[PDB]
């Protein structure tokens, strides 16, 4: 039992009810081209050309061999390109049920498979893009092998789902995916979970570790820091639990598994709950007639690290297992900075809201204040459980310093790991973007 | 001709650009008389040393080059010191250590290494004169400001009447202390690099 | 032990070689971008000063002191040349000893030795010693303390200049002007030990 | 054989440079000595009241009117020696001809007192009308040196001057202020009972007092130094017995 | 007078003691043994020289010369030496030119490496045959308003083996030059006299060295072909010394000879099935002609290719007949031109305007994938910057854009 | 008017990226909370200045001499005109008036000049005017004697703002304390209006020592108030009925004001505890070794706390987030060095009656070294794959 003591559990209105109910019919899916880190696509489809399930839509130039396949069958209707012809999404009208099928095995021989056979089947089916590597949070090369694979069987994000509710539905697929992963990994598999009981794989290669505390703890970065510290020499892969269910279903049935169970919740959702959906579903079609009237923001993922789902990016991400909707706040307040906050959340104790425990806050999307320089009153240390000096590393990221940030531990971090430091900043900085800048420079100077 | 003389005043200044020469500038600029005497001594020593190292530039042994150059520089500085203690005794008492520190002053040795070893005699005297001119520009500006605002006198002549002798001025105490010279040279560098942006350093 | 501790603490803090006496400000203000390089240069300065000051004390008291050689002679005009020659020769011999006998210590601190072959800090230390008429042990302690104070000052300046990666300095003040102003503020801080008569 | 060239060049250069250096340094030695002495001579002339300007006039008036002599601090009796070349500071430093003071005797924080001191008897004609006593004591930032001119009676003061003070230019360096120095003319060092009676009054001295002078304003820590200087030097370990002999007669 | 003798004696003796102790410490504490440098680790030939000196100096003494423009000081940074064991410390003066990659490959810059001990380095195999040559000038006719074509013929009829796009170092002794020496045909002598450039003059009194790029593919033998631009003083500051080497090459006529040294370069095309786009203008027509002619005639390549040129007027463009022949013999090749300020006499029926605008608007705007092609670029700085920015905005990677900078 | 309208109104903006919900705190609230915390100290300082001045005036002059003194100074006759009284039986209101006539002109001058320099720099560099100058101006106005000239306050705020802060980049981009740097400018430059016996009781013709200057001359027996004639008890220095700088005297009000900004998380309890630890250790060591000639060698640790500007500097000026150390392990060493240097300059330095700002400037010089030591100890863990 590793107990994380420094963190922050955001009190935000609209916690979902952990009951799975079917979702509204979806007629469009997409693959958001700007979420894959360091990708430059080679398109294998043209607007108006029919596709199948698990048919290649584009390919990578910087990562030769990694194929990004369609979630469902239908017709490509839109290929949105933004500024500098950067790919934004590939929208597919849902029609038909055709699909590309692969080889199917039994539950027994999943662990005795060949590593290269597993590699090629995952690459062809498109599930290879479920993996990401620390450092640099990139899809692994099809040639490389890792000595530690981290399965994330917990979810502590604000308004997140309950992994046990889902895994109790397909324990068979979860165990099959864990066997396949233990056959794929050179060293070990780390299933990171909470105290509750989960299905267990009978392999001596799979080890279950229990984590506990507020939420910096649900992130795979804390797990890697505490179980297998990563660097330029030691690289570790990370997959979530629904993708492991998908891997198990693939290797058991021979056909790609595209169904998901996401949590639709927020302050302005009429009835929060877990809703079934398909990979890459259209959020505007998923969440219509389900939000309160007014002006809201639809987010793909949590409020800490998500993507604003507007227009061409208004589809579910590949690595996001929830939707968050909350009202946009733009009111100018008379002395709002000087009002005693009965209804204002802060990690500081300068408002009256901290005196009332068990309170929930209907939070808008306003940035309380304006952009200013950093004055370290000590908010970053209160939300960083890792073994780093937060203020110095964040100043090294701000100052555009790559070597010093790498010495202070940038190679262990993702944009999700600095979301709380961005959250609690008085100067309204955003450290995920600066971390991605430094990591891009480090990838280049190699 | 003249441009080789006047380049170190602004375009390539010792104290402002080629950092060599800060130690005596921080110290002997309290009084304009000591600043002037230091300027003259540095000009004379640098010029004569460059001339002699140029005369013997070919026959200096590479193994003990530093000894052979320090011999000439230290002899010139020793002669200058023995002449100062005879005819200007008050100035030397306030210049006590920095008269001998002209040997380890960096201008005198940098001009002897970078120029005098590879140039003719007549241009080397001129190089020394020009570098001393820039040195003295800095010294005289800082000394003027410090002695005016800190003691109300210029070259020992009362200008702003102090309040102690029936006047209206109360002199500053920092202009006679350590930090004021740093600030004055920093703001002088700012003013110089405002008019000449080619000297502005790069962000990296 | 009461008298030698006083000299050490005095030379380190009450009269700092760099911020109180203004000796060596060229390398002080130039080689102080990194704490690593400043530490190495400070160690080299400590070593050279400790080896240099007592040897010059010996030479002075043996030859150059008035009436030391024969009665009625005063060879005190050779002070400058003798001191600078001893300092330069010691620096060169130390460079060669480190380069041939001990390659690691040479690659560590000998890299900075060509800079302090003729530095104002060491010559000023020897000059202050001949002024104050220290004994051999007092010269050793004074040299060690002066080197330690110089190292402390330059390491502090390097730490400040590394903290200042977050600053936004005007273009004309970028680099040398802001380093001058920083050293001025450091002297303003170091003026705490002004009245202590130790 | 490259050694011959470097040896020959180094020897020729050394001979030339050293001939020049030794010819310059030895030639100007007496000029340097005269320039060193004339400063103290001019200071003593200023303290004594004689007006002089220029090196020639200073030297002439000093050799005319001032006659230095030696005095034994213990008994206050003149000692035989070359007073013009006596170095009292080096004498006090050297252990053979100086005594150490205990903390209860060391009022002025000097810690060392020489045995024989020098005094400059001002004289017009054969008669001596004044005596100039050098006194010194520690201030706050440095040691302060003085020249007090005591009249023939042995009590009255005719002028004071600090030539070496080294304190803050406007708080405690006001010991070199002409007004504060003119405050001293007319005070009486000893009371009717032959004890030190010079007092530095904090707050200004009563108008017309004979024993008290004003203190420095903003500087009580270098007015303490002056008072301790005078208390020690007018005592038993200073010019006490000498001033007693002067008062009795036979200056 | 007594002190003068002691002063002289003591000064001399102290200086002797110091010098002699320095000499004794130097003689004993420096090995000064001879080192053998393995030019290439496996070949048995090696350089035996005293430890003192520099790597580039020892190499130049042994005859191997790298294409550096420094001569000491690391000005430009062309030298590349790969040592396995030798100079241990990597110097900050070369750390600017070396990244984290070659720091793991083990390379260094030649001027920075100092010979102190036995080292073994792996020079590139191609450096062995860099024999310098001296050849007679055949023709020096003016092919453009400010550009003249120079030709030299190699003895033994052996055109030095060099890939298309390489460059030679040509060097000359001192000379006195005036613009009344060389021939200027009337077509360009028009503007020449219109701005009376003959008022200029120059006198070089020291040897000089410059580099120039070849405009001939390997299969053409015996001849060395190149286009050289005159470095006419900028109208902003005219009184400055004119282009010394340019004016010298211009003053050169038939019959005289100069030194051509080294078949080395860096601007060589990559070989895939990726469409090629050649963007050149000004004096940079020479490497573009070299590349295109090589790819077409030598390799008989069929990959889709294009060539976009830039000139102020029709009188400035050249090799027109050659490129028409190439485009006629190979249908995949297609080339165009563009004039900034065309003239009335030429009766122009071609694209006019800046070449980046012309190329972007006409060709890549409708292209299904503007980032698939790979672009080769060489010319004036404004053309370079403009086309670089246009391609970046279109989305072409920096990998595809191979840029050659004349004097940068 | 629109430039000030940035202060009265919230900006009314939204978030653009990853953290779609932001914390409610900003820099404005932090700076205004630190500005409001020194109001009890400001008010008690004005009250104490007025009361000390009235007591000293009534001790020296009487009857017809008082009238000629109150008609000579505009502070006195302006109090008499506004409604107070300069007699010996004036209430608490006649003392706060006389204290305000001293404090408010200095605060106005400091605010105006510093704001001019700050607006000039932010205009030239095209930024927005920032808070955190409110704190600098109020602290500078509160750490100076009541009898300071206004041109000296202007020069000092100019030096503290331009050189120490604005030259480096602005708020949060400097390494030193602006208010203490300005106050140090006025102490070494013009040192007769900020030292001595005649600058701390704003009475015309009153020379009287403070308490860390009466202790150095004769010990705890020498602590007697000459204006009133009675001893300076411990509860006098704690409550604040002692002469000195304007807003430093009341340790009780300073504690009341600092407990708030320490509770809220704005001030550093680590730095405060470090200062207390260093002071207690060094003062107890001095009391243990002891001396005969030096009377400061026997001042207990609880007398060091209430005398001079120790509490003001420990609470409000040694807790500057930008000048201090950025590491939790470095903050302890920062505070310990501050307290140690303060006690050292108090005891073994004869020329300065206190060193609470020289200590803070020293620690400002040396804090980045502590941060460096800790981060270099942290890097060695990461290389061993245990961090
Ligand atoms: C790798 C490479 C390949 C090249 N290939 C070619 C090629 O194929 N064809 C070609 O024509 N050129 C080519 N060049 C360019 C050519 O080699 C030179 O850049 C230059 O044109 C000739 O050298 P130069 O001796 O005249 O230089 P310089 O004499 O140093 O420069 C001449 C010009 O510089 C100006 N100038 C110099 N100093 C100043 C000053 N202080 N103030 C004002 N103006 C000044 C002169 O007025 C004159 O216009 C190449 C350059 C490089 C680096
Ligand atoms: C609330 C903040 C934290 C509170 C922390 C409390 C820590 C207290 C530390 C106690 C240390 C010793 O406590 C302190 O000892 C010294 C010397 O021994 C005593 O000192 C006493 O004796 C000495 C020696 O004769 C005298 O010079 C001195 O004047 C007298 O007060 C102090 O009166 C006492 O306060
Ligand atoms: C607890 C706290 C204490 C502060 N103390 C000071 C101070 O003593 N002097 C000052 O000029 N600014 C002070 N500031 C304001 C701010 O920190 C100051 O501008 C920084 O030093 C950057 O300029 C303080 C701010 C906070 C939040
Ligand atoms: S003056 Fe000391 S180094 Fe140049
Ligand atoms: S050209 Fe400068 S290093 Fe080779
Ligand atoms: Ca002393």
Cβ distance A34 to A311 under 8 Å? no
- Residues A163, C116: Cα–Cα separation, whole Å: 67
- Hey, what are F291's tokens? 């001396």
The protein residue whose alpha carbon is closest to atom 47 in ligand 1 is: E233
Identify whether the C-beta of residue C154 lies closer than 8 Å to the C-beta of residue C34: no
* Matching residue, tokens 């450096």: E127
Could you write out the DSSP letters of every residue in A402-418?
A: HHHHHHHTGGG--TTTT
Strand partners, E9: none
Side-chain-facing half-sphere of E19: CA atoms under 13 Å: 28
Residues A60 and A158 in one domain: no
Distance from C-alpha of A298 to C-alpha of D86, rounded to nearest angstrom: 98
Rounded alpha-carbon distances, angstroms, from residue E327 to A140, E293, E313: 45, 11, 22
Which residues in chain E have Cβ-Cβ distances shorter than 8 Å to B67? 15, 18-19, 22
Which atom of ligand 5 is closest in space to residue E78's alpha carbon?
4
**Cα C167 to averaged position of ligand 3 atoms, centre (Å):** 16
* Together in a domain, E40 and E84: yes
Indicate which residue's Cα is closest to atom 43 of ligand 1.
E240
Task: Note whether E202 and E177 are within 8 A (CB).
Answer: yes
Residue A202 near chain F (CB below 8 Å): no
Q: How far is F272 from F331, CA to CA, in rounded Å?
A: 9
List the Cα angle C114/C117/C123 in 5-degree steps.
155
Residue E135 is assigned to a ligand binding site? no
> What is the number of the ligand 5 atom nearest to the C-alpha of E112?
3
Q: Last residue of a domain, which of A236, A253, A270?
A: A253
Between CA E35 and CA E45 the distance in angstroms is 13
What gap in Å lies between CA B79 and CA B92, rounded to an integer?
13
H or E element in which residue F81 lies: helix F74-82
Q: What is the 3-state secondary structure (H, E, C) of F46-76?
A: HHHHHHHHHHHHHHHCCCHHHHHHHCCCHHH
Q: What DSSP line would sit under chain B, residue for residue?
A: --HHHHHHHHTT-TTTTS---HHHHHHTTSSHHHHHHHHHHHHHHHHHHHHHHHHTSSS--STTHHHHHHHHHHHHHHHHHHHHHHH-HHHHHHSHHHHHTTTT-HHHHHHHHHTGGGS-HHHHHHHHHHHHHHHHHHHHHHHHHHHHHHHSEETTEE-S-BGGGS-SB---SGGGSSHHHHHHHHHHHHHHHHH-GGGPPP--
Rounded Cα distance between F377 and F383, Å, is 11
> D142 to chain C: nearest residue by CA?
C197
Ligand that comes closest to the CA of residue D142: 6
Take residue E317 and report the two structure tokens written for it.
């463009």
Q: Which of F60, F82, F139 is nearest to F318 (CA)?
A: F139
Residues E136 and E259 in one domain: yes
Q: What is the number of the ligand 3 atom nearest to the C-alpha of F323?
A: 21
Please, are residues D189 and D197 in contact by the beta-carbon 8 Å criterion? yes
Q: Give the minimum alpha-carbon distance from C21 to chain E in angstroms, rounded to a whole number.
A: 30
| Closest ligand 2 atom to F297 CA | 27
CB A433 within 8 A of CB A443: no
Q: How far is C85 from chain D (nearest CA, A)?
A: 13
Residue E34 phi/psi, 5-degree rounding, is: -80, 135
Nearest one of F36, F33, F40 to F250, comparing CA atoms: F40
- Mark whether A243 and A113 lie in a shared domain: yes
Burial of D20 (0-12, 13-18, 19+ CB in 10 A): middle
Tokens of B49: 């040393």
> CA of E107: how far to CAs of E73, E98, E165, E314, in Å?
18, 8, 25, 48
Q: What residues 164-203 of chain F have any CB closer than 8 A to a CB of chain B?
A: 185, 188-191
> Which residues sit opposite A291 in a β-bridge?
A269
The position carrying tokens 């820039």 is B134
Q: Which atom of ligand 4 is nearest to the CA of C23?
A: 2
Burial of D147 (0-12, 13-18, 19+ CB in 10 A): buried
Q: Do E4 and D17 touch (CB under 8 A)?
A: no
The span from the CA of A333 to the CA of F12, in Å, is 8
Residues 6+ apart with CB under 8 A from B201: C174, C175, C176
Give me the number of domains chain D comprises: 1
Domain with E75 in it: 35-129
Residues of A in contact with F321 (CB under 8 A): 375-378
Structure solved via? cryo-EM
In this complex, which chains have at least 3 CB pairs below 8 Å with chain C?
Answer: A, B, D, E, F
Resolution (A): 3.1
Closest CA to A423 of A403, A401, A394: A394
Query: Minimum-distance ligand to the CA of E149?
Result: 1
Task: Decide: A137 and A235 in contact? Cβ < 8 Å.
Answer: no
- The reply to whether E385 falls in a domain is yes
Q: Whole-angstrom Cα distance, residue A391 to residue F367?
A: 14
β-bridge mates for residue E306, sequence order: E277, E334
Residue D36 sits in which domain range? 26-251
Which residue in E has a C-alpha nearest to residue B74's C-alpha? E11
Interatomic CA distance for residues C19 and B181, integer angstroms: 12
- CB–CB of C35 and F174 under 8 A? no
Picking from E246, E247, E250, E221, the residue whose alpha carbon sits closest to that of residue E141 is: E250
Domain assignment of residue D4, yes or no: no
Beta bridge pairs of residue D193: none
Domain boundaries, position A431:
371-444
Contact A364, A329 (CB under 8 A): yes
Q: Can you tell me whether residue D141 is helix, strand or coil?
A: coil
Dihedral sign computed on CA atoms, order F183, F188, F189, F193? positive
Distance CA(D192)–CA(A112), nearest Å, equals 120
DSSP C70: S
Neighbours of F24 (CB within 10 A): 23
CB contacts of A227 in chain F (<8 Å) are none
> Are F203 and F349 contacting, i.e. CB atoms less than 8 angstroms apart?
no
Reading across the β-sheet that carries A188-193, which strands appear in turn? A2-3, A206-212, A188-193, A148-152, A236-240, A132-134
Residue E26 forms contact with B (CB below 8 Å): yes
Specify the DSSP element, H or E, that contains A207: strand A206-212
Last residue of a domain, one of A218, A253, A288: A253
Q: Which of D17, D35, D174 sits opposite B72 (nearest CB)?
A: D17
> What are the distances in angstroms from CA F5 to CA E229, F8, F9, F199, F208?
62, 5, 6, 40, 48
Q: Nearest to residue B113, comparing CAs of B65, B72, B78? A: B65
- Would the CB atoms of F22 and A368 count as touching at under 8 Å? yes
In a domain, A129, yes or no: yes
SS3 state of residue E203: strand
Query: Ligand 3 center to residue F31 CA distance, Å?
Result: 8
With respect to residue A314, please indicate whether it lies within any of the assigned structural domains: no
CB–CB of F144/F194 below 8 Å? yes
Cβ distance A164 to A187 under 8 Å? no
* Chain E neighbours, 3+ Cβ pairs < 8 A: A, B, C, D
Residue C77 has its nearest CB partner, among D25, D140, D141, at D25
E111 is in an annotated binding site: yes
The answer to whether residues A158 and A137 belong to one domain is yes
Could you list the residue range(s) of the whole structural domain that residue C41 is in? 1-198
Contact F171, C173 (CB under 8 A): no
How far does residue E180's CA lie from ligand 1's centre (Å)?
21
**Distance of alpha carbon C17 from alpha carbon C187, whole angstroms:** 11
Same domain for A131 and A13?
A: yes
Rounded to 5 degrees, what angle do the CA atoms F310, F311, F317 make? 85
DSSP 8-state code for residue A139 = P
Nearest residue of D to residue F191, measured between CA atoms: D171
Q: Are F244 and F308 in contact (CB under 8 A)?
A: yes
Contact status, residue A140 vs residue A227, Cβ threshold 8 Å: no
Gaps in chain B (C to N distance exceeding 2.5 A) after: none
Helix spans in F205-307 (H): 214-218, 234-239, 251-263, 269-289, 301-306
- Do the beta carbons of residue F264 and residue A350 sit within 8 Å? yes
Q: How remote is the CA of residue E128 from the centroid of ligand 5, in Å?
A: 20
Q: Which of residues 160-199 of B touch F (CB under 8 A)?
A: 170, 172-175, 177, 183
Q: Residues E231, E283: contact at Cβ < 8 Å?
A: no
Q: Is the same domain home to E234 and E368?
A: no
Q: Checking DSSP bridges between strand A206-212 and strand A2-3, what pairing results, if any?
A: parallel
Entry field: residues in chain D: 251
Residue among C73, C111, C113 with most chain E CBs within 10 A, to mutate? C73
Q: Name subunits touching A (3+ CB pairs < 8 A).
A: C, E, F
Residue having the nearest C-alpha atom to atom 18 of ligand 1? E407
> What is the C-alpha separation between D116 and D124, in angstroms, rounded?
26
Task: Select from C78, C126, D13 the least CA-distant residue to B72.
Answer: D13
Residues of chain D numbered 203-222 and touching chain C (CB < 8 Å): none
Residue F255: CB atoms within 10 A of its CB come to: 15
Alpha helix ranges (H) inside E31-140 = 55-61, 92-95, 102-105
Domain contains E178:
yes
- Residues E214, E291, single domain; the answer is no
Q: Is E337 annotated as a binding residue?
A: no
User: Domain ranges in chain B?
Assistant: 1-204
CA C161 – CA C167 distance, rounded (Å)? 10
Angle between the B65-87 and E2-28 helix axes, to the nearest 10 degrees?
A: 150
| Spatial distance between the Cα atoms of C192 and F351, rounded to a whole number of angstroms | 10
Which DSSP letter does residue A16 get?
P
Q: Is the peptide bond before A135 cis (omega within 30 degrees of 0)?
A: yes
In A, which residues are within 8 Å of F12 by CB distance? 330-333, 366
Residue D11 counted as domain residue: no
Residues E227, E317 within the same domain:
no
Q: E27 CB contacts (<8 Å, ≥6 apart)?
A: none
User: Which residues precede a break in chain E, with C-to-N distance above 2.5 Å?
Assistant: none
List all residues 6 or more positions away from E133 whose beta carbon is below 8 Å from its beta carbon.
E154, E155, E160, E259, E260, E261
Residue with tokens 């050394």: D14
Q: Is E258 annotated as ligand-binding?
A: no
| Residues contacting C194, CB < 8 A, separation 6+ | D141, F349, F351
What the block records as the tokens of B128 is 């020394």
F358 touches chain C (CB under 8 A): yes
């Amino acid at each position: 039992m590793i107990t994380i003591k420094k963190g922050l559990d955001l009190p935000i209105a609209g916690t979902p009810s952990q009951v799975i109910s079917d979702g509204k019919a979806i007629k469009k899916v997409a693959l958001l081209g700007e979420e894959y880190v360091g990708m430059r696509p080679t398109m294998h489809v043209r607007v108006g050309d029919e596709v199948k399930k698990a048919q290649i839509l584009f390919e990578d130039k910087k990562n030769p061999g990694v194929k990004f396949t369609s979630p469902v069958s239908g017709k490509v209707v839109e290929i949105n390109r933004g500024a500098k012809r950067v790919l934004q999404s590939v929208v597919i009208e849902v029609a038909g049920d055709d699909q590309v099928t692969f080889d199917k095995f039994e539950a027994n021989q999943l662990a005795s498979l060949n590593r290269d056979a597993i590699k090629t089947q995952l690459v062809e089916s498109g599930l290879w893009t479920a993996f990401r590597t620390r450092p640099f949070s990139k899809v692994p090369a099809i040639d490389s092998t890792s000595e530690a694979i981290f399965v994330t069987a917990m979810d502590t994000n604000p308004l997140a789902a309950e992994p046990t509710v889902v895994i109790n539905e397909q324990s068979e697929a979860f165990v099959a995916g864990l066997d396949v992963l233990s056959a794929l990994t050179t060293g070990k598999v780390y299933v990171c979970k909470k105290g509750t009981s989960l299905p267990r794989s009978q392999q001596p290669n799979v080890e279950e570790h229990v984590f506990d505390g507020p939420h910096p703890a649900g992130l795979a970065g804390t797990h890697m820091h505490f179980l297998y510290p990563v660097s330029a020499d030691h690289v570790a892969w990370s997959i979530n639990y629904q993708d492991v269910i998908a891997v198990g279903q693939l290797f058991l049935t021979g056909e790609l598994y595209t169904q998901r169970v996401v949590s639709l919740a927020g302050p302005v959702v009429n009835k929060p709950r877990l809703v079934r959906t398909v990979m890459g579903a259209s959020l505007e079609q998923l969440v219509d007639s389900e939000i309160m009237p007014g002006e809201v923001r639809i987010i793909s993922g949590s409020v800490l690290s998500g993507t604003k789902a507007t227009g061409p990016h208004a589809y579910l991400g590949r690595y996001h297992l929830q939707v968050s909707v909350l009202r946009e706040g733009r009111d100018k307040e008379l002395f709002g900075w000087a009002m005693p906050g009965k209804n204002k959340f802060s990690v500081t104790r300068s408002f009256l809201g901290h005196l009332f425990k068990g309170q929930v806050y209907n939070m808008t999307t306003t940035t309380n204040g304006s952009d200013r320089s950093m004055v370290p009153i000590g908010n970053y240390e209160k939300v960083m459980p890792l073994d780093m000096e937060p203020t110095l590393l964040l100043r090294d990221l701000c100052a555009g310093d790559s070597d010093s940030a790498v010495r202070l531990g940038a190679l262990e971090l993702d944009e999700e790991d600095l979301a709380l430091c961005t959250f609690v900043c008085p100067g309204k900085y955003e450290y995920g973007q600066l971390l991605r800048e430094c990591l891009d420079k480090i990838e280049k100077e190699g | 001709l003249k441009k080789s003389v006047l380049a170190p005043v602004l375009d390539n200044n010792p104290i402002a650009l080629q950092v060599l020469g800060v130690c005596s500038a921080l110290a002997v600029t309290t009084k304009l008389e000591t600043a002037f005497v230091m300027t003259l001594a540095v000009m004379f020593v640098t010029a004569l040393s460059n001339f002699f190292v140029s005369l013997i530039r070919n026959h200096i042994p590479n193994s003990v080059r530093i000894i052979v150059q320090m011999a000439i520089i230290a002899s010139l500085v020793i002669v200058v010191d023995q002449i100062l203690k005879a005819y200007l005794y008050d100035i030397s008492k306030q210049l006590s250590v920095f008269v001998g520190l002209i040997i380890t002053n960096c201008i005198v040795m940098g001009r002897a290494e970078a120029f005098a070893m590879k140039s003719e005699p007549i241009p080397s005297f001129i190089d020394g004169i020009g570098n001393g001119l820039g040195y003295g520009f800095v010294l005289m500006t800082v000394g003027f400001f410090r002695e005016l605002l800190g003691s109300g006198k210029l070259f020992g002549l009362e200008v702003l009447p102090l309040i102690s002798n029936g006047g209206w001025y109360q002199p500053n105490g920092l202009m006679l202390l350590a930090p004021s010279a740093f600030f004055l040279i920093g703001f002088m560098i700012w003013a110089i690099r405002t008019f000449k942006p080619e000297q502005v350093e790069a962000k990296e | 032990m009461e008298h030698y501790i006083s000299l050490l603490v005095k030379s380190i803090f009450i009269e700092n070689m760099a911020l109180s006496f203004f000796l060596g400000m060229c390398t002080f203000l130039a080689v102080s971008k990194k704490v690593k390089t400043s530490f190495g240069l400070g160690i080299a300065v400590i070593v050279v000063l400790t080896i240099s000051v007592p040897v010059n004390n010996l030479v002075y008291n043996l030859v150059l002191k008035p009436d030391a050689l024969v009665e009625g002679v005063d060879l005190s005009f050779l002070n400058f040349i003798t001191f600078i020659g001893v300092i330069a020769a010691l620096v060169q011999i130390l460079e060669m000893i480190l380069d041939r006998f001990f390659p690691p210590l040479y690659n560590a601190l000998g890299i900075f030795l060509p800079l302090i072959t003729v530095n104002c800090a060491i010559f000023g230390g020897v000059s202050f010693m001949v002024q104050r008429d220290y004994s051999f042990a007092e010269s050793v302690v004074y040299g060690f303390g002066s080197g330690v104070g110089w190292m402390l000052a330059i390491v502090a300046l390097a730490g400040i200049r590394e903290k200042m990666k977050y600053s936004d300095v005007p273009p004309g003040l970028r680099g040398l002007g802001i380093t001058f102003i920083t050293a001025g503020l450091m002297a303003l801080g170091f003026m705490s030990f002004s009245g202590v008569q130790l | 054989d490259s050694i011959k060239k470097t040896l020959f060049v180094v020897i020729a250069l050394s001979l030339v440079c050293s001939i020049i250096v030794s010819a310059a340094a030895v030639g100007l030695r007496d000029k340097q000595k005269e320039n060193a002495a004339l400063d103290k001579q001019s200071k003593i002339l200023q303290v004594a009241g004689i007006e002089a300007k220029g090196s020639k006039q200073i030297v002439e008036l000093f050799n005319k009117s001032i006659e230095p002599r030696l005095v034994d601090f213990n008994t206050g009796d003149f000692v035989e020696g070359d007073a013009a070349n006596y170095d009292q500071r080096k004498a006090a430093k050297e252990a053979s001809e100086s005594i150490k003071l205990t903390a209860e005797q060391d009022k002025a924080k000097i810690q060392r007192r020489a045995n024989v001191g020098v005094v400059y008897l001002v004289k017009d004609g054969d008669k001596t009308s004044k005596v100039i006593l050098p006194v010194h004591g520690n201030g706050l930032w440095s040691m302060m040196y003085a020249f007090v001119a005591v009249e023939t009676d042995g009590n009255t003061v005719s002028g004071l001057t600090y030539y070496e003070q080294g304190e803050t230019p406007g708080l405690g360096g006001e010991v070199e202020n002409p007004a504060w120095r003119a405050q001293w003319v007319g005070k009486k060092l000893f009371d009717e009972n032959h004890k030190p009676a010079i007092k530095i009054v904090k707050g200004g001295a009563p108008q017309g007092s004979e024993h008290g002078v004003d203190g420095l304003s903003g500087a009580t820590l270098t007015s303490n130094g002056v008072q301790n200087t005078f208390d020690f030097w007018l005592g038993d370990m200073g010019f006490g017995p000498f001033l007693t002999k002067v008062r009795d007669g036979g200056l | 007078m007594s002190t003068i003798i002691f002063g002289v004696v003591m000064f001399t003796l102290i200086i002797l003691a110091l010098v002699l102790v320095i000499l004794f410490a130097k003689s004993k504490l420096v090995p000064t043994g001879d080192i053998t440098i393995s030019i290439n680790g496996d070949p048995e030939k090696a350089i035996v020289t005293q430890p003192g000196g520099k790597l580039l100096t020892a190499l130049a003494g042994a005859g191997v010369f790298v294409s550096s423009a420094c001569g000491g000081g690391g000005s430009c940074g062309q030298c590349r030496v790969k040592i396995k064991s030798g100079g241990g410390d990597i110097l900050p003066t070369e750390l600017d030119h070396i990244s984290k990659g070659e720091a793991r490959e083990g390379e260094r810059l030649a001027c920075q490496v100092a010979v102190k001990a036995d080292m073994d380095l792996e020079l590139p195999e191609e450096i062995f045959g860099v024999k310098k040559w001296e050849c007679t000038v055949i023709s020096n006719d003016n092919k453009a308003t400010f550009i003249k074509e120079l030709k030299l013929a190699i003895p033994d009829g052996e055109s030095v083996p060099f890939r298309a796009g390489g460059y030679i170092q040509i060097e000359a002794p001192a000379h006195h030059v005036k613009y009344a020496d060389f021939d200027v045909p009337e077509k360009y002598r028009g503007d020449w006299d219109k701005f009376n450039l003959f008022r200029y003059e120059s006198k070089v009194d020291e040897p000089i060295i410059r580099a120039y790029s070849m405009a001939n593919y390997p299969e053409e033998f015996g001849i060395i072909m190149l286009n050289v631009r005159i470095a006419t003083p900028p109208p902003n500051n005219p009184n400055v010394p004119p282009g010394q080497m340019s004016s010298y090459i211009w003053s050169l006529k038939a019959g005289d000879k100069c030194t051509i040294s080294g078949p080395f370069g860096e601007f060589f095309a990559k070989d895939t099935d990726a469409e090629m786009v050649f963007i050149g203008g000004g004096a940079g027509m020479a490497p573009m002609r070299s590349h295109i002619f090589d790819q077409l005639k030598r390799l008989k390549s069929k990959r889709k290719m294009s060539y976009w040129y830039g000139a102020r007027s029709k009188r400035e463009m050249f090799y027109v007949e050659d490129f028409d022949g190439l485009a006629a013999e190979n249908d995949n090749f297609v080339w165009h031109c563009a004039l900034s300020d065309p003239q009335p006499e030429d009766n122009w029926t071609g694209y006019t305007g800046f070449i980046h605008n012309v190329l972007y608007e006409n060709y890549l705007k409708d292209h299904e994938a503007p980032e698939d092609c790979e672009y080769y670029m060489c010319g004036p700085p404004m053309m370079n910057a403009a086309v670089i920015n246009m391609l970046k905005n279109l989305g072409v990677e920096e990998e595809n854009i191979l840029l050659d900078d004349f004097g940068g | 008017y629109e430039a000030a309208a940035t202060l009265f109104y919230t900006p009314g903006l939204v978030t653009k990226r990853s953290s779609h919900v932001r914390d409610s705190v900003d820099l404005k609230r932090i700076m205004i909370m630190v500005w409001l915390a020194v109001f009890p100290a400001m008010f008690w300082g004005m009250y104490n200045a007025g009361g000390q001045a009235i007591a000293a005036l009534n001790h020296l002059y009487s009857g017809d001499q008082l009238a000629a003194i109150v008609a000579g100074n505009w502070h006195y006759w302006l109090t008499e005109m506004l409604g107070g009284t300069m007699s010996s039986d004036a209430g608490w209101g006649s003392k706060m008036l006389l204290g305000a006539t001293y404090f408010l002109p200095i605060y106005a001058t400091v605010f105006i000049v510093g704001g001019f320099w700050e607006v000039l720099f932010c205009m030239v560099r095209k930024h927005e005017v920032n808070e955190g100058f409110f704190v600098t101006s109020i602290l500078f106005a509160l750490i100076v004697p009541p009898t300071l000239p206004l041109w000296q306050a202007a020069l000092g705020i100019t030096f503290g703002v331009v050189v120490a802060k604005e030259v480096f980049g602005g708020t949060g981009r400097n390494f030193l304390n602006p208010a203490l740097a300005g106050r140090a400018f006025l102490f070494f430059a013009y040192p007769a209006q900020i030292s001595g016996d005649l600058v701390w009781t704003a009475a015309d013709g009153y020379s009287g020592a403070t308490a860390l200057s009466q202790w150095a001359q004769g010990g705890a027996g020498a602590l007697i108030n000459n204006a009133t004639g009675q001893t300076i008890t411990w509860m006098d220095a704690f409550i604040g009925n002692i002469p000195g700088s304007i807003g430093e005297v009341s340790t009780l009000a300073l504690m009341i004001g600092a407990a708030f900004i320490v509770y809220m998380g704005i001030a550093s309890w680590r730095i405060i505890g470090g200062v207390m630890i260093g002071m207690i250790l060094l003062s107890t060591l001095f009391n243990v070794i002891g001396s005969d000639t030096n009377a400061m060698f026997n001042m207990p640790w609880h007398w060091h706390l209430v005398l001079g500007g120790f509490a003001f500097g420990m609470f409000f000026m040694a807790t500057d987030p930008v000048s201090a150390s950025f590491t939790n392990s470095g903050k302890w060493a920062y505070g310990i060095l501050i307290g140690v240097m303060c006690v050292l300059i108090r005891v073994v330095n004869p020329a300065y009656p206190e060193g609470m700002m020289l200590a803070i400037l020293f620690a400002n010089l040396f804090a980045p070294l502590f941060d460096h030591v800790v981060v270099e100890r942290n890097i060695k863990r990461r290389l061993a794959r245990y961090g």
